[model samples]
Structures are given as structure tokens and as C-alpha cells.
Target chain A: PDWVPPEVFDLVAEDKARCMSEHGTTQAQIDDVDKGNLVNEPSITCYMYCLLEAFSLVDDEANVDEDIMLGLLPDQLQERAQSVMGKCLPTSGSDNCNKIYNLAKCVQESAPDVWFVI
Target chain B: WVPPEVFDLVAEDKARCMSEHGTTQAQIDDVDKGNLVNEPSITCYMYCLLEAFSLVDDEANVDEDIMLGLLPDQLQERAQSVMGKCLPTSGSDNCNKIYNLAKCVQESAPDVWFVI
Candidate 1:
């Protein structure tokens, strides 16, 4: 791992904890995800939506905040994130959780390194 | 209670606002306790925080709907009443406008206006 910014870790952690508690996502499941296990479980997917939404990186109607999302990425991941965002953006799915899950998958498909847990 | 997103933004906003306005923690505490003076250091910080959330517009005009949306359910009625009377915010500048609004709010419903 190239490492996420130290400042970003706290922000993500603060929301991640709250989102996990709210969505009932277990630490074990989240650890699996951190290890690149992309599953369709609400315990993980909805937690993703909740965490992203907390940072204003995505909205309720499935709108992704492109600039804000890109702004948060480290330099090493920035260019890849931009390309993935170009193809995967204008997100589509049945609901919020599915949308984020799809987004995570889309990013991973194009640029595996761009998506990770801090 | 406020939405988590809005609540989270407060920490960042307050830090920036305090620095921007030369507002000290003492001043913020005073404002929090409903003791608002007309000083720009404190008053402008209020406007800055409000503006960051788009609770107020470029000209420091309060957006009633957005402001109401952030307040607690129990505060809904009192906030509407306070805003209705105090709005159409008037003063020489953005800071003064917020100062006047704060005073008016504190006068009518002392607990309605808060710094954080």
C-alpha cells in the first residue's frame, strides 16, 4: 500500500466507525474488504454509502461528488482515480447501497490501487 | 440534533472561521452562552460559519428553508418565528448584518442562536 494521507485517516475513521455501527458492519467483514474482498452484503455496502455520504462524496440520488472525491485522493492514486471516475461515474443502481457497491467495483475493475481502506 | 455530515463539517469550519476572524475561544464561548457583542472578531465568525454552510448567501442574506432544515424538531416553530421577524437581514456589512441578526434572535428567543 502506498499509504493514505495521515489527515484523511482520522476523517475516514470517524465516519467509518459511525457508519459501521449504524449499518451493523462487523470489523471482521470490514477487514476482509480492506483485504480486497468486494461482496454484495448490506453490512458492507450500505456502510460504504454511509461513509461516502458523510464526506459529501456521494448524495442520496446517486450523484457522486467528482471534484471532492478526487481532491481527497493522494497524489499516487490521483490520476488513476480520475480515469476510473470518468468511466464509472454518473452512478446507477437500485438504491444507495447498491450504487456505492457498484462504484467500488467499478473503481476496482479499472484501477485496483485507487480503492482501499485507510 | 443536526445531521452527521453537517455536524462533522462544524469542526473544520469553526477552526477556519476562528482563524479568519481572529476570534478566540473565549469569544466563541461567550457567543455560545448568548452574550453577543458587536465586535467583528466574534460577529464575523458567526457570519463566516453560517456562510460556509450556505445558511446565508453571498450578501449574508439568510436562507430560511436551509436554516430551518438544520435545526432540531423542537426548535422548528421558534426558529421560524425568529427568522420571520429578524430576517431581511440589514446592516452596513456582512458582519454587522449577522451581529444585528444575532441580537434580534437573542432578544426574542435567547436560546435560538448558537455559535457552534
Candidate 2:
């Protein structure tokens, strides 16, 4: 069973809607992200910011709490979250979209696949 | 001794890289484990990071003042030496030089810096 809270999906949905409307992200771009095609698209990165904000994961200076992200899941999955975050972090851009796209891409590649449908 | 605020800035910059550029902690872990000279990706990661921090130029040229600013007074000469040996000239193939430079920094001062 997926350990992520049900509300998390709703959060994702809310953010996705916000991203598509605000950042101009498309389903196609998001698909590319799923395939690990990292880019500096503002829409994609902004989508990421919405999701991170939804989770309250990033600090004011934009640092993510690996522990907080891990705690979003079952104890067994915490380690996996760490790996995913590490892989995702390098792609984070100076702006919101860059940060979000890298993060989403990393999460998709990481174990168990924590996804955000935006 | 470096003030705690400097460390705070380091941590913040680190976070900025991680959150914005998608730099992985695992890459940083490799730096901590002294694996930079061997891995091309980690080395490049360090290059981008150093660039992000404005410690190096886009061409991978070492910025002497910016870099020395981060180091302790005692490490200044050593840092200069490392930069002298490793800093690439403009328009040269930067990948190798930056990698070597990062490797040198990592070896010389592991404490003042995080992942180099």
C-alpha cells in the first residue's frame, strides 16, 4: 500500500492546476520530466515549487528537509526518500521552475516512485 | 576561526544548490568520502556548485578573492597554491582542470568546505 497520505494527492492536484494555469506547464512537458529529460523550463520548475510548498518541505532560503520528506512516508521508505532527494537536488535551478522540475524528475526516478501529476 | 554565520551561509548555499539546481546529496557524500577525482559526474557537479557559489567563473577559472574569502587566513596561501596548480585558463578545456582543482581543494581543506 502507498504510505503517502491521501491528502497528498489532493495537494498535488491543487498544485498541478495552479502550475498549468500559472506556469504554463503542459502534460507533454511533464511527460518529458518523467523520462528524466531535465530542462530549465519555468513552468515545469514552478510546478515543482507548488508541490514543495504544498508539503512545506522547503525553507525560506529554499533548502529541503530530507527528514521531513522521509517522514511523509512509512519508516521503511525514508531511506528511499533520501536517495530520491539527492538525485533530484542537483537539477534544482535558481528559480522555482528549475527547482521543481529537477525535484520531480528525481522523485520519479527514485524508488517506489513518488509522483506528482502536473 | 570562522564564525558560525559563515557556516550558516554555507548551509544556505548548499540548500540553494540542492533545491534549485538539483544537485544530489549523494554527490556531496562522494565528495565527503574523497571520491571526486575519480568520478566525472561528481567532479562536474562540484564544478557547477563552485560556479553557482561564484567561486569560479563560467570557464572554470578560479576566482582568487572569492575562494580565499571562504577559507581561513591560514589556508589562504595553500588555497592560492591549489588554484595556481588547477585553475584553467580561459577558453581551455575546463572539465579536467576544474575537476583537478576540486580534487585539490577537497584534499587540502575538508573541514572549512563541504563538498568541493
Candidate 3:
């Protein structure tokens, strides 16, 4: 079996093009946010913002004990959770891109004519 | 024998100002978001949400046994006792205020927790 090198494995141009396109945009954004490139504002705020956006999922680990962080919250969370859930409920099943299946039958309608993409 | 002191019965004019507003729709509507007023359903859902959130922490890439074992000793023991019981946290604040009591115990004796 001919083994291809992992660094430059042969892939279709479409796959390479997709990653290249995404990297171009990501690199430009990173360059803009880099140090000493800003005009009249503090850089720490933007730095912190980017850091937070990246680690938002895991940021809670910094303070709360992991056990308590993972602990079961009884009904009280519902009052607050529903406040957010209720807001999302209206838009939940409205869009083809965001329809929730398995709970409602409205899933049958959201297919765009892009059978080739899949 | 207890006796009533009402001497006169006013016909038709005794009660005329109240309407039976069908059971509060707000509470019922909360069911969709797992926030029903029914104690069992609401509590179960709350525990489920906690379980879901807990799983995120559980599956997190961290020291597992240390995390679980390092909880405040008293809180750990108490948590074991009420392992599955779902108590109210919002409105039942007088006698069933475990959250407040837990906070107090946790605050007053920080030594109870060994977070190493």
C-alpha cells in the first residue's frame, strides 16, 4: 500500500479551496486584532473579548468548583431557563436552518433544492 | 360544638363580584420550557437540567476524582443524603430554605472545603 505523507495528503481541490478560503478570512481577522495595530482604544478589552469568545464554553471552570459547576440544580433554574427558552421558542421552528425535529412534524418542509451539496 | 353567629341570610346579594379565571395560563405555559408549577414535574425537570449541565462539567477535560472528592465535606455528606430529592428553591424560602442555609454553612466554615 502506498502511504501518502500526512502533511500533504492528496485531497480534491474543492476541499483544499474550502479550507483555504476559511483560513484567509480567519488570518485577516487575527491580524486586525493583533497587538499595536489599533487606533484610539485600549487593546486589553478586545484581547479579553477574543479570549472569552474562544473559551466561553469552558470559562465557568475558572471559578466554580467543577463538581458544583456540574451539580444538579433543582427547579429554580427553570424560572430563569424558561425566560431564555421562551424567547427562543418563537424563532425555534420558524427557520429552515433552525427547525427542531423529532418533536414536531414541521421538519418535512425545510429542504432546499441542494441535493448535490450533501 | 362550634356555632356560627350569622343571624341574617341575604338572598342573591351575598356574593356577586368574583369570576373564576380559568387556571393561570402562565404556569401552564411554563410546561413547554419544563417550568411547570407542579412540584414533581418541575423538580424532575430541574434535576434533569442540572444533570444535563452537570454532564458538561462531568465530560469536561479535568481531574475527575479530585473534583468530586474535594467538595466541602459537609456539603458532600449532605448531598449524598438528599441524592435525588428535589426541593424548592424560589418561593419556599421560610422553612425550606436549604440554599440559604447551605450558603451560610459554606461561608462560615470555609475550612470544610479542601480544594487541593
Candidate 4:
């Protein structure tokens, strides 16, 4: 599904089409890229998982200093995302989304941790 | 512009549109909450961020993990209804699509970071 044979833009075409259906990015961003201006516009596709992984990064033992992730996510998104993060921990498949929600719940559990997780 | 009627579905603006949309589990859960089951449900417009995200991850090793951005409030409202009309559709790998766009961009911004 990821690859495009015959050296045409098959793989690339399909990937972009899926993004359009999901509301991940805007038509403007796509047009911008078509015109050659895709910088600083964080890849909308990988955003959720990255934020999830960001949580993991903070939880990692080496990241003790940043145990509390400050400014990691924007204010508006913190509450719901972290809420889902606590209640549902996303896994490889759909269940992984629930895992993320659970992670948010755990992050909400600690008052001190809350100080930074948000 | 891109060969008009005979355009490549997987490599042009139409393909771009597909990359821009896909269904998410959050909405499915919401429908469950609203008791809107039985009938065909609908979620806001989401192109294909996850699919595209995966592509970027594979090629760049920068952010292999998916980073799906939630739809805005306005989108969450009625877009689903319209999306429902366009149902019975096929699958599109948004993450990989975005990867193509990113590849063109990366050809330019070598030092830029952040998922965007």
C-alpha cells in the first residue's frame, strides 16, 4: 500500500489522498507544497503519535529532569489530548488510542506531574 | 493542468485531496456516546494524516510515529454529515501522500524540524 511501482508517483499519490480524507492537513498546506513551500508546518499526519511519544520521552528514565513536560503541547490541546492520553493508551492498532487516553489519566493523577504534563 | 481527465489518481490534486482525509477512532467513540449507531455514522473531514505521517517516518527516521492532529470544533460539527454522503469509499494513505509533499519540501529545507 505504501509503495508505488513503475517509478511513478503511485505511493505518494495514495498517501496524500488518505491525508485529505482524514482532515490531518489543509488544502492550503498541500497547495503550498505543490508550489514548493513546506517548512515549519509540522507533519499533521505524525502529530498525535509524536505527542504520545513525547509523553513516553518524558516518562523515560533518562528524561527525569523533564519528568514534567512543559510547553510540549499547546494549551488548547493539552486538556483533551492528555485526557485521552490518561484514559486510552494507543497501541499498534486501534487499542493504542485507548492507551493514550489512559496515559492522559495517569498524567492527570499526579498533581505535581500535572504541573508539567500539561 | 495535470493531463486533465486522464490524470493519475494516485499522484495529483485528486490524490492530494485523498491524502487530506481519513476516519479516526475518536469520532467512532463519539458516535457510541451519542447512541448514533445502527445507521451509518460519520466523522469530521480528515484527509490522510496518519498514512502520510507513516511515510515521513519511514523515509526520514525523523518521526516514525503517527501524530494525528484532532479536527477543529467547526469541522467536528456538521462536516461529518457531508462526509457521510461520500461514504462507501476506499482507503487512502494520507501519511505517505504528505511524505511526497515533504520530500519536495525537504529538497529545500534541509535544517527544518518539527512535525508540522
Q: Which candidate is the best by DockQ?
A: 1
Interface C-alpha RMSD, model 3 = 32.9
* TM-scores for the candidates: 0.56, 0.37, 0.18, 0.20
Model 1 chain B worst lDDT window (10 residues): B1-10
Task: Name the weakest run of 10 consecutive residues (lDDT summed) in model 3 chain A.
Answer: A109-118
Model 2 agreement with the true structure over A1-118: per-residue lDDT tens digits: 2121111112244445655676687888766544445466676666556545544455435566564354334334457656766777644556645565556555654543344222
Model 1, which residues run further than 4 Å from truth?
A: A1-91, A97-118, B1-8, B72-75, B111-115
Best by TM-score: 1
DockQ of each: 0.03, 0.01, 0.02, 0.02
Give the count of colliding residue pairs in each prediction.
0, 16, 0, 88
* Per-residue alpha-carbon lDDT of candidate 1 for residues A1-118, written as tens digits (9 for 90 to 100): 2211221123355566777888999999877666656688899898877766654566667788787565445445567667888999988888878888898788777765434553
Q: For model 1, report the TM-score of its A chain.
A: 0.82
Docking class of 1: incorrect
Q: Is the docking of candidate 2 incorrect, acceptable, medium or high quality?
A: incorrect
lDDT of 1 by residue, B1-116 (tens): 22111122345567778988999999987776667689999999999877765568878998787566544445679879888899889999999999999878767764334433
Strongest candidate by lDDT:
1
TM-score of 3: 0.18
lDDT score, residue B66, model 4? Answer: 21
lDDT of 2 by residue, B69-95 (tens): 543345568768877765553333555
- Model 3 chain B poorest 10 in a row by lDDT: B9-18
